[model samples]
Target: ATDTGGYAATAGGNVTGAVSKTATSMQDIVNIIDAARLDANGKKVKGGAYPLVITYTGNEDSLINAAAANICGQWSKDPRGVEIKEFTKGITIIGANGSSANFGIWIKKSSDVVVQNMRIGYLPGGAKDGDMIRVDDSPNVWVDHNELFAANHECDGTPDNDTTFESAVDIKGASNTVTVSYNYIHGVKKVGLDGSSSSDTGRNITYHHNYYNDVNARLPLQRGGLVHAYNNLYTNITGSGLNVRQNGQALIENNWFEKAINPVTSRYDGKNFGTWVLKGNNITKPADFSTYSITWTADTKPYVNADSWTSTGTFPTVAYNYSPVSAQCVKDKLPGYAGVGKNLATLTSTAC
Candidate 1:
């Protein structure tokens, strides 16, 4: 049956005095995560605080990209298949980088994991299975303050589409209670996918204060979920944005869209499109909303109450320190302020 993951107030690694773990090699990173996982009964083998703070020791480009491919494969393990463990302190994984990375990481059946303050992707053909980060059956996860993109190294030709790198993030397999905020995702065929549409999973994801730049489509190709997407800035999209389908219910509010080819559409691939409640958006110098609203529907159910049609129950309440800026200002500041080592002081400051 369809359901929600509820609120993620302390989601990610926001626990007190999380143990500090350092990773210099990819194997080290893997071992840390494997060690922190809980047993079958959701108890840590060596109990500690709520989450573990894993920090990368070396530079971002070489450290992350060098052994990521091999490490990623190991991370894609099944939850129940192994004697896995959940984190009590949660897990805060942080990194920094200048160049592109070759592999992506997968989070499965883990709860309260936070990935922040890093740069991922932007490799010529580095992405395996076309994703920078894949979250499956994980709950209370947070992805923030990162730059994710796919590009060719030579700067001359278009990158491979849907083969080398498809999307920046994908939350699937009932990975609920997630928050993706303060991220810069760009230059990919798909930006995000909440659910795969083949099954009734992937529910209760939140996206706020993100910058989607030069993306072709799929601001999020959502399927079978309750999603709250708000305060995002989208620009230079080639195809339809926000393709909600397969009974997905989306609350799109206070977003900014500029130069979007197709800002919003539904039911593109013959799937039964879901419902979208649009409000408080800013679209300037773009095509008509009516053109894209042609496929919009009122099929919101199980996702929200049809009587009020409100997001009180579905949408999440964000409590971060991020401040809103104009779309133009976002475009101007993002290219400079995004990526690894981006100064968060300026990001949260009024200057941005």
Candidate 2:
């Protein structure tokens, strides 16, 4: 009677969810995500177990350093394929950076999971190769209260260049009712929170009360559903603070953006169809990283015979070369918003 939506897993015999500041070795926490305990079909048993909890009881931050281990331990490892059949009430992951390697926490599942209260530091090769936690295609999940910093630039904690390299969290595919909150994400490459996909339904996401320091590019893809990004802090971003693509009724409010090359932009391709609202965000950041900079233009003018527009508006925002503001005060002011103007509607909206 195993379900096809996804399978389940039971707690392993020796895996312990508790740890102390003096507790040495990653074995304790690493077991939580290990794949060795899976059945041939790749599912967590109940004797099996249900809702495995891995929490840290230590004062010092430790890295369980589960390098290539799958936190749920139930994956088929198909690079282009996603495992959506691995379901549970959710997987509860806690952290203590064992200080072993320069990384911490990695979880993936079919649906319904939670990862909280973890501190990740010293990622090798900076943010490129490092991340506090990465979850894909898990629905109705929660990731909160985790502090991620010190992604090594050239070494172990390298950066992932897909969405500007900066890393606090990286999410891909359609994961709904996801709540990422109350975390401090700073120092690294790329966006603090990113959502990208090959699917059209990657929708209904909410981000709140997070702190970001010195990053680049936020919301770097075609957002198709409901996105609520708010109540966060940003400092030293060389690019726009928030960038949204084909979206629907995205509510952006009560967030603080301290520095930026530009505050917000919503640009969509011809095939993308949706309208996202950019409202009530507080942005304050450095105006420019360099002088006489060239602003890159993102072409929203869809190709002739491209994709179809299911909703309204041009690429929700426009792609204009961002110019480095003349003074720091220019970056301090938040009222300037450049979007794909209404006049563009005269042009034919393309479709897939």
Candidate 3:
């Protein structure tokens, strides 16, 4: 019954005794979480002891403030973020209206976590561990209604020469089920990934109603996952989108793509190319390419491109029910429903 339509059905922290609290800094969030784990006797509980909802009313302008203070070295040398680790109880971190964060949120070995309505930008430590949200070894997580942005250009001398900036969202290391919805992401080189490597793969993920603009690449470089994507708006993709590899399977539908290069393809190790089922997208036949401004180029390895606009493989029937509006409707109405200020709103075909 969740709007998160895929293999994930999570209520996050929407539960009884979800005591509300506010956080104004990364340490505040950590303190609130630590408090949630304490018993009445002040003993530690392995899992969180109670349900809680955290409201982030923060403006950690780490970039502007740090630059002005001339202490930018501190952030670049050491990344800043909140690491939600090993908490079993459900929790939600919802940002206050107009709140801004210059840090990242990393989830590891946790479950039933949710993040919403946050504007996270200009995170430091992209050379190391700075992803706006990194879900690792967790499940039943939802990232929704957030704005994540960074420079689309990568610096020269970074690790791998490819990681000068980190991804907006990276799901890896047994993070089995996740729903990323209604987020406004821009100016990021790597939007997200389904796995960290070829051997590190497999999950059930859903991506819907997200607005991806001017992102360079990786509309989720999926690796061996069952992904259901729908009603998302993708534009100005300077590089490839949806690089499905390692025999992964994806169901892509009802999405609007404009001026995106290689909207869907299998790349990297082209040997074990993934499979995708496409339907109801703005582009259909090869002739539609010029109108949509869709373009393709060959990879060094023999990659499979979706330029033909046909399903390359079959997908199983989805486990959840969802009604997706037309691609035109998504192009028209998505901006209203996606991003930080909409107050957790959703779109339905009935409304469209």
Candidate 4:
């Protein structure tokens, strides 16, 4: 069973169809996806020709080096990526141990997709959906064991003076049942969005076992629906975390937040604000605030902050089975289990 312990539970591309292929470059992956339109008999398939598992063997040394050099511009132009669009049969794209990419993986109008064990950094195309991964109008998706990174600061003269880089993993449209887990995400301005806009809502997405550092905002900006976020390590969140808006709900528990501003808040819309059932976080109460670092700032815009350190609203019981490691364990051990390499392993409570 491919039980991902969240809204998403899927075994992508594990179905029939000769089952395996390898991609050595960006164009190779694109070509492979193009070939998935027709079946072996050359007959047209409604969604995809067949379920397939693609292992990317492409190298990302250039992208890594360029990003490390703090380069921009080039990425926004001639952006690189593999688009899994309207091919809903099921596809799993895994990267080899040392494989990395300069582009993003955009999945649209598809379902049962799994992307694992790849390193994607400093994507281009800016506000034009240059997300490290974009799940649009898709469902039953699991994004695990991948490292996504970008600059935390926006480049000057860029659109809105920010968004030089897009989100790391953005789930929007009619996407439902998604799980984003076990990966190192750092130095990103916008981590991701739950819904595209105020009207773009609905979905049960989960974020667990991730290492978020130096990010600006959108530890997902939920417009509507539910989000279960737990067991993550947040450090230096310059903007905010979990801005649940549009009357949405969230269960924020068992996470470690340090040096984060507005760790759990509902803002931006200024009306019909959402609620969160806060529990199991490192700072469980106001007295524990000194133990952990969290900053609350006053703003001109109306917003809801979880200064009470308690549940603001009720929530539905989690359907999936999961045991979150302690907040201390998440802070201490997350780096080992998250991100590409070292295998896709879960940090169990017993080991914690």
Best candidate according to TM-score: 4
lDDT of 2 by residue, 1-352 (tens): 1111111222211135321222233454554434423555778563223434555444333322332232121111111111223545344554444322234444455454544455554343232334445655655556665665542222222122342122556666655546565555555455444355425455456665555656555533335656555545555655555555554445555555544444455543555544444434432222322332313334456412101212223222311111122222222321121101111111111210
Query: Once all C-alphas are superposed, what RMSD does model 4 give against the true structure?
Result: 1.4
Model 3 misplacement above 4 A: 1-3, 62-75
What value does the lDDT take at residue 214 in candidate 4? 89
Computed on alpha carbons, the lDDT of every model, listed in order, comes to 0.58, 0.42, 0.86, 0.86
Q: If both were scored by TM-score, which would come out higher, candidate 2 or candidate 4?
A: 4
In candidate 2, which residue ranges exceed 4 Å CA deviation? 1-25, 33-48, 57-87, 96-101, 125-130, 151-166, 192-195, 198-200, 219-222, 267-274, 283-352
Ranked candidates, highest lDDT first: 4, 3, 1, 2
Model 3, position 127: C-alpha lDDT score: 66
Best-first order by TM-score: 4, 3, 1, 2
- What is candidate 4's lDDT per residue for 211-243, written digit by digit as tens? 998888989898889999999999889989889
Which RMSD does model 2 reach against the true structure? 14.1
- For model 3, name the residue pairs that clash: none
Clashing pairs in 4: 75-124, 76-125, 254-280
- Give the least accurate 10-residue stretch of model 3, judged by summed lDDT: 67-76
Residue-pair clashes per candidate: 11, 65, 0, 3
How high is the lDDT of residue 180 in model 1?
77
lDDT of 4 at 352: 78
| Candidate 4 segments exceeding 4 Å error | 74-76
Better of 2 and 4 by lDDT: 4
Best by lDDT: 4
